[PDB]
Write a protein that binds this ligand. Structure first.
Ligand code: CU
Ligand code: CU
Ligand code: CU
Ligand code: CU
Ligand code: CU
Ligand code: CU
Ligand code: CU
Ligand code: CU
Ligand code: CU
Ligand code: CU
Ligand code: CU
Ligand code: CU
Ligand code: CU
Lengths: 294, 294, 294
């Protein structure tokens, strides 16, 4: 794309504010931003807000979202599909033209860990170039195990392919498969999907803690076999719905776009790798680290 | 196959009749039939009854099936394996020679949404060429959410490869991944697995309705990440067994041959895409449409 | 690897003994051993104890494992990661150098069917070359269906690639996908992952029996769609945890490293194939047989 040559739009902060007991405003951008996905490898990503995956959104069950997308891409239209919401896709997930904005309103009635992504045709191209992310909807009555949790983080898995190559997107193996972490509280790391950041700067915890991870595999194409080395998941809630409760799982399978809330205890000091156990993907980048100290 | 050159056997209707309170007769054919799997692309499919996937079969829990296969293929033997039944594979799923018939009897004791397919060696070749389908076994006591359902449809996902190419079947990516719909009531569409029919002629519903889909991924090779754009699944029954109940899932993972009953509400008028969220497969055809009107 | 040329170390028996009501000693080797993975095809595997997958380990819920690895490989370091245990990976899953031994201690608190494997970097290389296996942890209170089970076996699925070829391990399709069986009681077969042994020498059962299979898909890379032809799973316990109970499943999806306990009835005499229903993998070897006699 000639109009993207030389373009590197600086990241713009997510804007969110509550406007009523059950209403929240969210404003995002669509923008073109260089991201280092592996050491020495820059991908000129199509992004929300200059992050890939995009910024974390958190709302409460029952919130209506008033969402605005400002399209900063000079030539390509973009859109937004939140898996959390009930909406008419042909009226509410529609394209915003370059240099324009669009506003859409829809309710988030269901708790869980949902994917969001651009919905512009061809959707594979927009997702693969980086237009994906997670929205968490907090359950009204929490999770049954809330009282046991000592620390929590968000992890997202995605793939990267050859740059803007539709043949590779459709028919090729991923070049990289990566984790990123998105901040829930001040001080938490907030990273892009790359092969190295969560190895060099591990997530942190204390010996004996029960950790909760909110996880989602945004794809675009692969399923995930999510596993924390050195522990077993005490509790798993599929898609983050409190009713979908499994216990004692070694590994949690996630479809493309699938999410979960997983909880586990770290019993001894050391560094605990976090992987997809499809080890071709782990070898291509999908290993994060959790450093546990006394 | 020289004996298949020029062969295009017209579709034959499925024959079924109840012969007792718990006994049903089913008669199918194995036949060679040209199917348009993508615009301008004809596949000379190996089929049951001239449809790929084959015709829908529906029985009640506890029915014994008296099944006859008439093999119209001039050279290749064919057989039938129903996942619904308890049977001896080496006596009951055996080959029927060209121009012959065979009759087999076995019970369907378990409710759900089951794959059926030809069981002739090499099974990969017979499935990939089109010999797959779905049998639904209705639960004796229904599903707990029956009273909420306003409309229902059946969807099946399958792949297509290079024509009768065993190397591609074993080692290659699918050329197309497709949905088809099979009729439950008069007026419902009944389609083959192709990239376009359910886009051009969407399934129909009314605003506010709760929709039930009976779904199965027949493969042969891929898993599915089933998702309806613009909604969340209120209830999911894995393999269609009423006990395997999940709630509030954004996306339902299906193994190869796996089925489910999923239910969701459409809240606003518009067109709702239905996808596998493995977007390489969606790009290669696996998008259907649901048109919701006021 | 020049130091592996001509090396074929004879299999060494697993050593295990109980040393207290809740403590068990286990001693394994890491060794280089030629295995016939397909007719006429020898793979010089990296193994535990000269088997690939490695020997079966069975312990009770709540046992602490005192594990010793003796590394017989002349040049490559090796290690052990048990998915069953809570451990510090950076202190307890560490490398043992050639011709040395290491001892590690950790508890197995959770019931189920867990993968074990070498944890030496790059882990993909060590798993793909054969360093994988299963440990079963028996639940304190059993499974709710124990009284119904007449016979039980263990099955493991794995892949084989081009010999020690990291590009193929990361980017290629498997050359073979295979089942193996590991003995639970005297007289049970104990086999390696190959394309033929469980076809030529099927597992055995009697008409009318309820069979339990302990299953795990060790990968390294693929997910599994586990199915027994001619039956339906009466009960399924995901990861072998008694709480994760599904009923009436035709096919059980397993992530890479995922396990299950599955139970089904064989109603008629004959031979029942056992497959992954991803039929490209079945065609490449992943079909076992169960012979049922009167
Ligand atoms: Cu507003
Ligand atoms: Cu876009
Ligand atoms: Cu989506
Ligand atoms: Cu704690
Ligand atoms: Cu009859
Ligand atoms: Cu056939
Ligand atoms: Cu089958
Ligand atoms: Cu209604
Ligand atoms: Cu000891
Ligand atoms: Cu090793
Ligand atoms: Cu592991
Ligand atoms: Cu019995
Ligand atoms: Cu799955």
């Amino acid at each position: 794309i000639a109009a993207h040559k030389g373009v590197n739009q600086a990241p713009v902060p997510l804007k969110m504010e509550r406007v009523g007991p059950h209403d929240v405003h969210i404003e995002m951008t669509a923008q073109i931003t260089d991201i280092e996905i592996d050491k020495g490898k820059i991908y000129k990503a199509w992004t929300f807000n200059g992050q890939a995956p995009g910024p974390l959104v958190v709302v409460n069950e029952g919130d209506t979202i008033h969402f605005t997308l400002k399209n900063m891409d000079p030539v390509v239209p973009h859109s937004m599909d939140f898996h959390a919401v009930h909406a008419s896709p042909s009226k509410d997930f529609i394209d915003v033209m370059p240099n324009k904005s669009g506003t859409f309103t829809y309710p988030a009635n269901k708790p869980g860990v949902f994917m969001y992504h651009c919905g512009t045709k061809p959707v594979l191209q927009h997702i693969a170039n980086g237009m994906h992310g997670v929205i968490i909807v907090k359950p009204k009555n929490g999770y049954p195990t809330d009282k046991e949790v000592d620390r929590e983080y968000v992890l997202i898995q995605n793939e990267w392919y050859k740059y803007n190559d539709m043949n590779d997107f459709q028919n090729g193996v991923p070049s990289y498969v990566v984790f990123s972490s998105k901040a829930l509280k001040p001080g938490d790391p907030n990273t892009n999907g790359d092969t190295f950041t969560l190895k060099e700067k591990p997530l942190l915890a204390k010996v004996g803690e029960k950790i909760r991870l909110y996880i989602n595999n945004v794809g675009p194409n692969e399923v995930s076999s999510f596993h924390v080395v050195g522990t077993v998941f005490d509790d798993v809630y599929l898609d983050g719905n409190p009713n979908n409760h499994l216990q004692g799982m070694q590994t949690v399978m996630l479809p493309a776009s699938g999410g979960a809330v997983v909880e586990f205890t770290v019993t001894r000091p050391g560094t605990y790798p976090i992987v997809t156990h499809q080890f071709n993907h782990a070898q291509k980048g999908a290993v994060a680290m959790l450093k546990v100290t006394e």
